[PDB]
Amino acid sequence: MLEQPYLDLAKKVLDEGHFKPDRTHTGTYSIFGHQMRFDLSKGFPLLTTKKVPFGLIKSELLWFLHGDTNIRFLLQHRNHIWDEWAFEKWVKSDEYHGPDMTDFGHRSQKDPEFAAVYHEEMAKFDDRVLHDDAFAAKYGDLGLVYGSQWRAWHTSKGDTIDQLGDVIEQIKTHPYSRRLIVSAWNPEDVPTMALPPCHTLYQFYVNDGKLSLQLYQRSADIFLGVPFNIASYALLTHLVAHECGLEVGEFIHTFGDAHLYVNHLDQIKEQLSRTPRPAPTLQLNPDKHDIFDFDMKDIKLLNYDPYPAIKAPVAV
Amino acid sequence: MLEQPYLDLAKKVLDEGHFKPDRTHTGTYSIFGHQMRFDLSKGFPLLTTKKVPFGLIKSELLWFLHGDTNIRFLLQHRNHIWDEWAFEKWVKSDEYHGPDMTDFGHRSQKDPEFAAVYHEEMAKFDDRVLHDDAFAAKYGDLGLVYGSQWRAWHTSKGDTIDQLGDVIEQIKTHPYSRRLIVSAWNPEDVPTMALPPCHTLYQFYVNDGKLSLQLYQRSADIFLGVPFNIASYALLTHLVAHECGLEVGEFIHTFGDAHLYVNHLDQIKEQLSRTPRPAPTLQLNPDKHDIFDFDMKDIKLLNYDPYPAIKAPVAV
Ligand SMILES: O=c1ccn([C@@H]2C[C@H](O)[C@@H](COP(=O)(O)O)O2)c(=O)[nH]1
Ligand SMILES: O=c1ccn([C@@H]2C[C@H](O)[C@@H](COP(=O)(O)O)O2)c(=O)[nH]1
Numbered sequence A, B: 001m002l003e004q005p006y007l008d009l010a011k012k013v014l015d016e017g018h019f020k021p022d023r024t025h026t027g028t029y030s031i032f033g034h035q036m037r038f039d040l041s042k043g044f045p046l047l048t049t050k051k052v053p054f055g056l057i058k059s060e061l062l063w064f065l066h067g068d069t070n071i072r073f074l075l076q077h078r079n080h081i082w083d084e085w086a087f088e089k090w091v092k093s094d095e096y097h098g099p100d101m102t103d104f105g106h107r108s109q110k111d112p113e114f115a116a117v118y119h120e121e122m123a124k125f126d127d128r129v130l131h132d133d134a135f136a137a138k139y140g141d142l143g144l145v146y147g148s149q150w151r152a153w154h155t156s157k158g159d160t161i162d163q164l165g166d167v168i169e170q171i172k173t174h175p176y177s178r179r180l181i182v183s184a185w186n187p188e189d190v191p192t193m194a195l196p197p198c199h200t201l202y203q204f205y206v207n208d209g210k211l212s213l214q215l216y217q218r219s220a221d222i223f224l225g226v227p228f229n230i231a232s233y234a235l236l237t238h239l240v241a242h243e244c245g246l247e248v249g250e251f252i253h254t255f256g257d258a259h260l261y262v263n264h265l266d267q268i269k270e271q272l273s274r275t276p277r278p279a280p281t282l283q284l285n286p287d288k289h290d291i292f293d294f295d296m297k298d299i300k301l302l303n304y305d306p307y308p309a310i311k312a313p314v315a316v
Helices: A004-016 A054-065 A072-076 A083-091 A104-109 A114-131 A133-139 A146-151 A163-173 A226-244 A262-271 B004-016 B054-065 B072-076 B083-091 B104-109 B114-131 B133-139 B146-151 B163-173 B226-244 B262-271
Strands: A018-020 A028-039 A181-183 A199-207 A210-221 A247-261 A281-284 A299-302 B018-020 B028-039 B181-183 B199-207 B210-221 B247-261 B281-284 B299-302
Touching: A004 A028, A004 A226, A004 A247, A004 A262, A028 A262, A028 B028, A028 B199, A028 B210, A028 B247, A054 A072, A054 A146, A054 A226, A072 A114, A083 A114, A083 A133, A104 A114, A114 A133, A146 A163, A163 A181, A163 A199, A163 A226, A199 A226, A199 B028, A199 B199, A199 B247, A210 A226, A210 B028, A226 A247, A226 A281, A247 A262, A247 B028, A247 B199, B004 B028, B004 B226, B004 B247, B004 B262, B028 B262, B054 B072, B054 B146, B054 B226, B072 B114, B083 B114, B083 B133, B104 B114, B114 B133, B146 B163, B163 B181, B163 B199, B163 B226, B199 B226, B210 B226, B226 B247, B226 B281, B247 B262
Parallel strands: A210 A247, B210 B247
Antiparallel strands: A018 A028, A028 A247, A181 A199, A199 A210, A281 A299, B018 B028, B028 B247, B181 B199, B199 B210, B281 B299
C-alpha cells in the first residue's frame, strides 16, 4: 500500500527512538539517517490514514514556484502556515503598539484570556497585510524563504540566481546530469535565521524517461510535518516532470534527525491502527506546461478517501 | 562483517542498475537513492577485499582540515589525487610553452608516445609547484575545493566563514542541535566549476554520548571512488568526536546517483568472490585534541589485512 514507508517510519521511531531533548521544552524520540521511497506511478502519496489539507500544500508550493516570499498570497489563499513568522517580526518593532505579546505561541498553549488576544491581534496584522500595500511590503515579506532560496539565491556580486529555473533547463537539455541539484542551505544566512531550512537540498534524476527526486530533510516532525512534506515534494516531482515532458518515477525522502514529539505518542498509536485505503490520483492541466504559471485550478486531486483528521498539539 | 553494505551496494547495482550514458564516453549501470550505515564502534570501514591506500586518504583529509587549497602540501605528502586539475589550468595558459596537451587524460588511455610526454610534463609542473613559490601560488592553488568550502566559505560581503570550525563549537555547546550541517554546494560557483562537489553536504548528530555523521554524495563511482569516500568520512567522524570528547557512533552514506562504469564490471565481480576479514582499528593520538593541528603521525591504522589491490581503468 503506498503510504506504508510512513507507517513503518513511525512504528520504527516508536520502537528504536532514543529519547533526546530539543529546542522546545517538549522532548522527542529520535532516529538519525532514514530513507523511504515512493513510486509515484502507483498513486499520489497523500495519507489516507488521516486527513491532510491538500489545498494548503498546493498553495504553499505555488507560492514557492512563483519565487514569492510575501505572505499576502498565502493569505489570499486562506493559508496561514507562515503567519507567525511574519507576526513575530511585527511585534518586535516600532508600530506595534499593542498588548504583551512576546513568547505568544508557547503562551497560547496554556493561555489565559491571551489566546483570543493573540488571535485577534493576529487577525489584525493579517487583514492589514492583505489590504495595506506598504504594510504588506514591510511586515508581510519573510525574506529568506523557500521561494527566494529556490528562485533568487543572492550572489556575492549583488545579483540573483534562479536555481530551480536553471535545473529545469538542465533537465530539458541534459537529462542524465548528476548535477541537477537545488539548495536552500546558505552558510551566510543560517547563522541568524529564525528557522534554517528543514528541506535542505534535493536532487533530480532522469532515467528511462522517468523523472525522480530525492530530498534531504535535516530535521522532521514525524507526526505533524512529514505528511505535508511528502506531499509537497511528490507534487513538485509531478509538476517538474509535466513541464519537461517526462513521466513520474520515484520520490525518495532522506532524513537527518527524524523525531516524534513526546506529546504526539497516543495520536500516532491511534493512527497506526487504521488500515490504508487506495491512493488518490493527481490530475494536472494538459493545456498548461509552464509550472511557474500554474494556478490552483490546474492541479486536481482525484479519489481521496481519508480517515478523519487526528488533532495534536504543536509542540513549543 | 563491517564492509558488507558496500558489497551489497555493488551486487545491487550489478543486478538492478539501469544502463545510463554519462559524461565520459564510457557508460554506466546506475541507481538513484541508496543509504548504507556503518557502526564505527565495530571497526574502521577501510575495505579488506581490496587494498585501499590509507595514507592518501589521511593526507587528503588533513589538507581539507587545514582549509588549504594548494597542491604543494599533498605533493609534499606524495599524494597526487588532485594534480590533473591544477595541471589542466597550467596547460590552458600563457607560460605553458610545451607540447600538444589538451584532451590529455583521455588521450593517455589510448596514448601514443604521449603517455611519457604527459607524465614528464606532469613531473615538471609538480616539481615546480614544490619548489617555485610564485608558481605554486598561481598554478598550484585549486581555489574552490573542499578546504575552502568547509573552512572559508566566501560571503557576499567579501568575508570568509569557517563552517566546520563553527559546527565543532556547536557540537561542544549544543550537542542536540539539528542544525549541525556543513555544505560544499554553492549556487554561485557550481555554474562554472570543473567538478562541483560530489560530497555535497554532511550532517552531524550527538546522542547518548556518541557522535554520528550522515553524508549526502550526489554522485558516486561504486568501484574506484566509494572505497575512499567511506574512509574519508569515517576518519572525519573519529576526528571531530575526539576533538569534542565524544564517542564514535555511525557513519551513514546517502547516495544520489550511485554508478558502476561499464569497464569495471569484471573487477567488481572479481572482488565479490573474496570473503571479508576483520576490520582495522583506528588509533588517534591521546595528547593532541585540536584536529586542525593533527598531523600524519597522529592517526594510526591498526591490523589491516587486505586482499591484493584490483587495478581498473579511470573512465574518461
Ligand atoms: O517535518 C517537519 C519539518 C520541519 N519541522 C521543523 C523541524 C523541527 O521539527 C522543528 C524545529 O526546527 P529545528 O530545531 O529542527 O531546526 O520545526 C517540523 O516541525 N516538521
Ligand atoms: O565516489 C566518487 C565520487 C566522485 N567521483 C566523481 C563523480 C562521478 O563518478 C565523476 C564525474 O562527476 P559528475 O558528472 O558526477 O558530476 O567523478 C567519483 O569518481 N567517485
